[PDB]
């Protein structure tokens, strides 16, 4: 009964699959044998503690390592050229030119290049010396340890929180949305005006001199008199250099807007004023609900309002809402799905507000770093959402009561799901058919030698929104292109600098477009459309199908329902998840390559290739597929090596595991068992080796496990090669 103890059942089987199933449930708690709610709640408390602790450990790891054997200061002196340092290199199996192609930045040992980009962000926060981050590591380490101990304490009996202490929401609401970051952004603002801005202006403010010197010479005057423009004193000059005082300034909260003419990034005073704004805004948002004290908004009863002004309601916006607000407090998969969806969305938005609004210095010039970060974050984002949809699906089977929601809005959704999925299939079919037809149009027409017989569309809605934001390139004189309209005296109170910036579209700020962008954007539309299609199909079948309604009781599990009608394989409520994962991978590949080609053409300004060969797909696979790989493919060859051999190895390794995935996917478990029989027959009857016997009787794999391993191999094969390609290309072409 020892392993696995958390399930007395699974420890009653002499087949190796035990081990396989032993390590695929240890993190599915509510399926263990004999643990009611509060046990789960308290141990989840502790385990979440441990998670944030190991996050802190990770941060300390990277920061201490760069503090040890890096060139952060040698990156201070010559910033725009000196390359950062990851860590040391130590492998006896290594090559020959490795040490010969590694030691740079004055180093004599095999340094490893760094790409994530902590140097820029950290110096932006105002670090100067190794000792700074040395001590930084030293103390957030003890912070992590103390947090670990805190996690341990609440395990003791006298320190066991109550289930009601978990259900009560409004205190957590207020404490978080006001006292988690509002006050924390206030503290960050204090660190900004006390440390960050001085270090930007070249003055060193340590841990002792900060007690006696001022943020502003006019300091404490508008403190309690109310002339806050005084702190908006002389701003930084048109020639200031960070870390220096050449044309310095003495303004704390400015609203300059646009960019800084040297770092081409966001202005630091705008940042401080921004943070202050949101801080006080969340604080005033803090007392917004009702607490245990006797005022405010009772969430679980605010939307329990079915009467106002005679005409009662059906609810807010005149729709039923009664009976579900306990569910968000009943289930956990619900909150988890909401959080996952939200997080994925804002992560994508982050990934979008980077290549146009450089937050830190030197961000725009160093292509490889920002490029890797962009695709990194978007990749993180994509299946982050798939997690939300999957947990929505699993919520639909476990956490759902019928009569408690009779006739509310959810049931009215379920009553008409049919038209939803039908019209969704419709729009997918339409967009796919027509985009492919236009593509093949172009292909055949250009395949005859006459390109003028071929269609060119031209998008103008994005053109109109571009000019309407204030772009003049197209000369339409509308809404800040019309400098005399009603709104032409509004916007920022420092819109002149913003206008100088945006008119200077030389940087990555809303570049012009053409027909290709029309094409690929419709392709994106299609992609997400079919992705959400398959996902919602699986979700709304989490209960049952027309030709298999029972599955609600079969579970979010294997069910195969052997060949009743031609077969019923892949009906198990996350069969859809595999399909969705494929449909997300190809989508994100499409979009990231679009971004890559766009910015690559922007690099040397030669936009001709993109617009010229975006129509027919031959151009796609000819202009950018192999026209950048010989810069990488010959990293090693029968004649020599480079600092890229490891990246070619990356390529080939990824391809290998990719095809291994196919092997696992195609062949099925009706053939890999016959030969295991005869192969057991061997050991029984050969001599001098029949001494040993079996720990446990081996059998073939399982079906679901086979599917899972195949998918894992496929995804890992897909991940590696593309990353290697993108960073190698960016660092080899500039």
């Amino acid at each position: 009964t020892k392993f696995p103890k958390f399930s007395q059942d699974l420890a009653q089987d002499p087949t190796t699959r035990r081990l396989w199933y032993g390590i695929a449930t240890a993190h599915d708690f509510e399926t263990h044998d004999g643990m009611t709610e509060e046990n789960l709640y308290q141990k989840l408390f502790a385990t979440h503690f441990g998670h944030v602790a190991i996050i802190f450990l990770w941060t300390s790891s990277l920061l201490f390592h760069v503090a040890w054997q890096g060139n952060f200061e040698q990156w201070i002196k010559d910033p725009l050229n000196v390359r950062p340092i990851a860590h040391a290199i130590w492998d006896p199996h290594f090559g020959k030119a490795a040490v010969d192609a590694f030691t740079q930045a004055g180093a004599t040992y095999p340094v490893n290049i760094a790409y994530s980009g902590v140097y820029h962000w950290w110096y932006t926060i105002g670090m100067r010396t190794n000792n700074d981050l040395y001590s930084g590591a030293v103390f957030l380490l003890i912070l992590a340890g103390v947090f670990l101990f805190a996690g341990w304490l609440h395990l003791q009996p006298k320190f066991r929180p109550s289930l009601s202490w978990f259900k009560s929401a409004e205190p957590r609401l207020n404490h978080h949305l006001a006292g988690l970051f509002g006050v924390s952004s206030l503290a960050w603002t204090g660190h900004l005006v006390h440390v960050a801005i001085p270090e930007s202006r070249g003055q060193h403010v340590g841990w002792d001199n900060f007690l006696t010197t001022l943020p502003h010479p006019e300091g404490l005057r508008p403190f309690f008199t109310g002339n806050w423009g005084v702190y908006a004193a002389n701003p930084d000059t048109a020639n200031h250099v960070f870390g220096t005082s050449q044309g310095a300034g003495t303004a704390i909260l400015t609203f300059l807007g646009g960019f800084h003419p040297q770092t081409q990034s966001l202005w630091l005073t705008d940042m401080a004023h921004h943070h202050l704004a949101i801080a006080v805004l969340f604080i005033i948002a803090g007392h917004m609900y009702r607490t245990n004290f006797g005022i405010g908004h009772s969430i679980k009863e605010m939307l329990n309002a079915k009467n106002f002004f005679g005409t009662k309601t059906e609810g807010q916006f005149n729709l039923p809402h009664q009976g579900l607000y306990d569910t968000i407090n009943n289930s956990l998969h619900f909150q988890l799905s909401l959080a996952l969806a939200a997080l994925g969305t804002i992560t994508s938005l982050v990934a979008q507000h980077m290549y146009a609004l450089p937050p830190y210095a030197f961000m725009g010039q160093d292509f490889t770093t920002q490029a890797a970060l962009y695709t990194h974050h978007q990749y993180i984002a994509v299946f982050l959402m798939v997690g939300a949809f999957a947990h929505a699906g699993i919520f639909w089977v476990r956490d759902y009561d019928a009569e408690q929601n009779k006739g509310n809005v959810l049931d009215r959704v379920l009553q008409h799901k049919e038209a939803i999925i039908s019209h969704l299939s419709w729009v997918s079919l339409f967009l796919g058919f027509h985009t492919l037809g236009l593509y093949v149009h172009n292909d055949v027409v250009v395949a005859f030698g006459t390109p003028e017989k071929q269609i060119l569309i031209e998008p103008v809605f994005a053109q109109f929104i571009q000019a309407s934001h204030g772009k003049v390139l197209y000369g339409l004189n509308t809404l800040l292109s019309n400098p005399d309209s009603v709104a032409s005296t509004a916007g920022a109170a420092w819109l002149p600098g913003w206008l100088d910036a945006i008119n200077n579209g030389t940087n990555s700020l809303f570049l012009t477009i053409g027909p290709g962008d029309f094409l690929v954007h419709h392709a994106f539309a299609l992609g997400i459309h079919t992705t959400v299609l398959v996902l919602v199909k699986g979700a709304l079948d989490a209960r049952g199908s027309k030709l298999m309604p029972d599955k609600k009781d079969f579970g979010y599990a294997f069910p195969c329902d052997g060949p009743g009608r031609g077969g019923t394989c892949d009906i198990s409520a996350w069969d859809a998840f595999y399909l969705a994962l494929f449909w997300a991978l190809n989508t994100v590949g499409w979009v990231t390559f679009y971004w890559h080609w766009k910015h690559l053409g922007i690099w040397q300004g030669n936009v001709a290739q993109f617009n010229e060969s975006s129509t027919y797909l031959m151009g796609w696979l000819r202009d950018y597929l192999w026209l950048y790989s010989a810069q990488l493919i010959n990293g090693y060859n029968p004649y020599g090596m480079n600092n890229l051999s490891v990246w070619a190895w990356m390529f080939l390794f990824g391809h290998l595991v990719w095809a291994t995935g196919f092997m696992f996917l195609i062949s099925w478990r009706g053939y890999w068992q016959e030969l295991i029989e005869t192969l057991v027959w061997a050991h029984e009857r050969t001599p001098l080796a029949s001494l040993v016997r079996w720990k446990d009787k081996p059998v073939a794999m399982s079906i679901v496990q086979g599917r899972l391993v195949g998918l894992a191999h496929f995804t890992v094969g897909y991940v590696l090669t593309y990353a290697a390609f993108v960073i190698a290309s960016t660092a080899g072409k500039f």
């Binding site: 508008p222 403190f223 008199t225 002339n227």
Partner: protein, 150 residues
Amino acid sequence: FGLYIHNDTMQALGRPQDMFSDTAIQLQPVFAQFVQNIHTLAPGSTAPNALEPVSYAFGGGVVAVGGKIAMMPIALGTADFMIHHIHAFQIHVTVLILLKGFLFARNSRLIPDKANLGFRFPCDGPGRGGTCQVSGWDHVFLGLFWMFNT
């Protein structure tokens, strides 16, 4: 007070460096100074439609007429500290006496018949040792002595 008499002894003991004014061991009531300051520059921003400060003891110019002062800014150095603190001291003890008579008016831990007997009466015999002056208006007697001092 013991701090005061400590400095007294030090001055009488040829140890003048152990005094407590500016020329010796330091203490400065920064709070009053800062509040007066933030009062000095009030007009314009806090008081736009206002011409001069509310008074001239906080800040402003020394306002006068003839060879005769009308109002100048007042200076708070070291001696202010213990003076204000002994003010607070005596007010505290006054409240102590009065509130003590207030709460222990009807029932004491020894006399459970006070309100059952009155509030203007001299004593309750030499029980428990002595009990003279256990009414309330004797509490206010002592209190009025103390407020006299204050």
